[PDB]
Enzyme design. Structure first.
Site, mmCIF file in Angstrom:
data_model
loop_
_atom_site.group_PDB
_atom_site.id
_atom_site.type_symbol
_atom_site.label_atom_id
_atom_site.label_comp_id
_atom_site.label_asym_id
_atom_site.label_seq_id
_atom_site.Cartn_x
_atom_site.Cartn_y
_atom_site.Cartn_z
ATOM 1 C CG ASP A 25 46.319 53.179 49.891
ATOM 2 O OD1 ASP A 25 46.619 53.665 49.073
ATOM 3 O OD2 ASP A 25 45.481 52.195 49.810
ATOM 4 C CB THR A 26 43.976 48.805 53.338
ATOM 5 O OG1 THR A 26 42.969 48.211 52.648
ATOM 6 C CG2 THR A 26 43.117 49.265 54.741
ATOM 7 N N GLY A 27 46.312 49.286 50.832
ATOM 8 C CA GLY A 27 47.549 48.636 49.858
ATOM 9 C C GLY A 27 48.175 49.246 49.742
HETATM 10 C C1 LIG Z 1 47.673 55.227 44.835
HETATM 11 C C2 LIG Z 1 46.482 54.914 45.148
HETATM 12 C C3 LIG Z 1 45.338 55.539 45.531
HETATM 13 C C4 LIG Z 1 45.669 53.884 44.636
HETATM 14 N N1 LIG Z 1 46.775 52.574 44.023
HETATM 15 C C5 LIG Z 1 46.510 51.848 45.332
HETATM 16 C C6 LIG Z 1 47.222 51.184 46.200
HETATM 17 O O1 LIG Z 1 46.758 51.170 47.400
HETATM 18 C C7 LIG Z 1 48.879 50.840 46.088
HETATM 19 C C8 LIG Z 1 48.571 49.195 45.951
HETATM 20 C C9 LIG Z 1 50.004 49.413 45.079
HETATM 21 C C10 LIG Z 1 50.857 47.957 46.064
HETATM 22 C C11 LIG Z 1 51.245 47.481 45.473
HETATM 23 C C12 LIG Z 1 52.284 47.769 44.447
HETATM 24 C C13 LIG Z 1 51.742 48.591 43.668
HETATM 25 C C14 LIG Z 1 50.731 49.416 43.933
HETATM 26 N N2 LIG Z 1 49.525 51.181 47.073
HETATM 27 C C15 LIG Z 1 50.832 51.978 47.535
HETATM 28 O O2 LIG Z 1 50.745 52.276 46.023
HETATM 29 O O3 LIG Z 1 51.473 52.273 48.206
HETATM 30 C C16 LIG Z 1 52.485 52.976 47.809
HETATM 31 C C17 LIG Z 1 52.841 53.975 49.540
HETATM 32 O O4 LIG Z 1 52.911 52.534 50.041
HETATM 33 C C18 LIG Z 1 54.378 51.547 49.562
HETATM 34 O O5 LIG Z 1 53.470 50.051 49.577
HETATM 35 C C19 LIG Z 1 52.993 49.189 48.577
HETATM 36 C C20 LIG Z 1 53.835 51.009 47.558
HETATM 37 C C21 LIG Z 1 53.881 51.883 48.197
HETATM 38 S S1 LIG Z 1 47.376 51.760 42.407
HETATM 39 O O6 LIG Z 1 47.327 51.339 42.648
HETATM 40 O O7 LIG Z 1 48.055 52.789 41.567
HETATM 41 C C22 LIG Z 1 46.006 51.792 41.524
HETATM 42 C C23 LIG Z 1 44.836 52.059 41.267
HETATM 43 C C24 LIG Z 1 43.012 52.312 40.774
HETATM 44 C C25 LIG Z 1 42.888 50.808 40.786
HETATM 45 N N3 LIG Z 1 42.014 50.422 40.114
HETATM 46 C C26 LIG Z 1 44.000 50.090 41.253
HETATM 47 C C27 LIG Z 1 45.024 50.477 41.903
#
Ligand SMILES: CC(C)CN(C[C@@H](O)[C@H](Cc1ccccc1)NC(=O)O[C@H]1CO[C@H]2OCC[C@H]21)S(=O)(=O)c1ccc(N)cc1
Lengths: 99, 99
Positions: A25-27
Site C-alpha cells: 500500500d503506497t498510500g
Molecule cells: C486501508 C486500505 C486497504 C484502503 N485505503 C487506502 C490507503 O492507502 C489509505 C489512504 C489514505 C491516506 C491518508 C489519509 C487517509 C487515507 N492509507 C491509510 O489508511 O494509511 C494509514 C496507515 O499509514 C498512515 O499513513 C496514511 C494514513 C495512515 S482507503 O483510504 O480506506 C480507500 C479504500 C477504498 C478506496 N476505493 C479508496 C481508498
C-alpha cells in the site's frame, strides 16, 4: 520482479513466527496489522485513515521477511480491517512505482 | 516516470479542467477525490478503510489526465481527507510496482 495492479497486491510476510497476507500500500505511511502478539516494548499511537482514527500499539525493530528481504521495521498493531504494508517497509526493500 | 516511496507519492492530476494533487495509492481499489462537482449520473457507494466507512458518489466514464496519460475511468467523490488515485486508474496508465 514486477507486480501489476489489476488485482489487490497481496504478498505473504513472515512476522512473529507467523505467515500473514498483507496489502502492498503506497498510500500508507506505516505498516498496520490486525491484532497479533509481538514481543518487546510498545507505545500507544493514533493512526488516522479515510474513516477516522484508531488506537494502535507501536512495536519497533520487528524483523519481517517480505519479498525475499530480511527487513526490520516499526509495526503498528490494531483494529485495521486488513493488514497493510506501508512506505516504511516498501522503501526498505527497494520498491518503486513506474509508468 | 519512476517514483520512489521515501516521500508520499503525490502527482498532479487534471480532471474537468481542474488541477489537483493526488496520492498514487496501490491500496485503494478506486480513485477517490475530495468533494467536488462532476457532471452526469452517479450512484452512492460505501468504501471502507482504517477507522471505518464513508459514503461516496460514484461517477463513471470521467476523463482524467495524469502525467500526460489520459484515461477515462470511474471516480469516487466524498469526504476523503486527500485525493487518492486508485488501482482502477493506475492500471490504465500502465503503472506497476517494481523492486
Ligand atoms: C486501508 C486500505 C486497504 C484502503 N485505503 C487506502 C490507503 O492507502 C489509505 C489512504 C489514505 C491516506 C491518508 C489519509 C487517509 C487515507 N492509507 C491509510 O489508511 O494509511 C494509514 C496507515 O499509514 C498512515 O499513513 C496514511 C494514513 C495512515 S482507503 O483510504 O480506506 C480507500 C479504500 C477504498 C478506496 N476505493 C479508496 C481508498
Amino acid at each position: 520482479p514486477q507486480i501489476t495492479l489489476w488485482k489487490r497486491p497481496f504478498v505473504t510476510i513472515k512476522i512473529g513466527g507467523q505467515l500473514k497476507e498483507a496489502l502492498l500500500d503506497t498510500g500508507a505511511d506505516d505498516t498496520v496489522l490486525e491484532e497479533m502478539n509481538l514481543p518487546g516494548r510498545w507505545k500507544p499511537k493514533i493512526v488516522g485513515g479515510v474513516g477516522g482514527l484508531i488506537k494502535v500499539r507501536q512495536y519497533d525493530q520487528i524483523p519481517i521477511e517480505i519479498c525475499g528481504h530480511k527487513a526490520v521495521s516499526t509495526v503498528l498493531v490494531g483494529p485495521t480491517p486488513i493488514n497493510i504494508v506501508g512506505r516504511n517497509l516498501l522503501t526498505q526493500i527497494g520498491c518503486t512505482l513506474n509508468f
